Amino acid sequence: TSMLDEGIMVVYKRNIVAHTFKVRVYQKVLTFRRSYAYHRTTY
Amino acid sequence: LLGSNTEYVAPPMWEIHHINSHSQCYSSYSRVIAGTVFVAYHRDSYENK
Numbered sequence: 630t631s632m633l634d635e636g637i638m639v640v641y642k643r644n645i646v647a648h649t650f651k652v653r654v655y656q657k658v659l660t661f662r663r664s665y666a667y668h669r670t671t672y
Numbered sequence: 673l674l675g676s677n678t679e680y681v682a683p684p685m686w687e688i689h690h691i692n693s694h695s696q697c698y699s700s701y702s703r704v705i706a707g708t709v710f711v712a713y714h715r716d717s718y719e720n721k
């Protein structure tokens with residue numbers, strides 16, 4: 630007593646590259662130096 | 673008790689050369705900003721030991 634579909638395949642990832650976008654940051658920088666004064670040698 | 677600024681500063685190159693050829697630093701920092709030079713000493717009124 631003697632005695633399989635075929636096709637075309639496209640595979641896809643889950644994508645992991647996190648989304649970039651630029652951001653504008655507005656801010657001010659106040660700096661306070663302080664000094665002493667005697668003769669000609671500022672401390 | 674009042675404030676406490678503390679700033680971290682690079683020595684001058686002549687001093688770098690001193691440091692690593694003698695194992696010692698000078699007890700004074702000096703930096704010029706705008707016109708005049710400014711200067712700090714270790715304990716107050718100290719010299720440049």
Ligand SMILES: *[C@@H]1O[C@H](CO)[C@@H](O)[C@H](O)[C@H]1NC(C)=O
Binds near residue numbers: 698700702711720
């Ligand atoms: C301390 O001494 C060094 C060399 O002896 C000198 O270059 C420096 O200007 C001095 N700092 C002072 C006098 O404040």
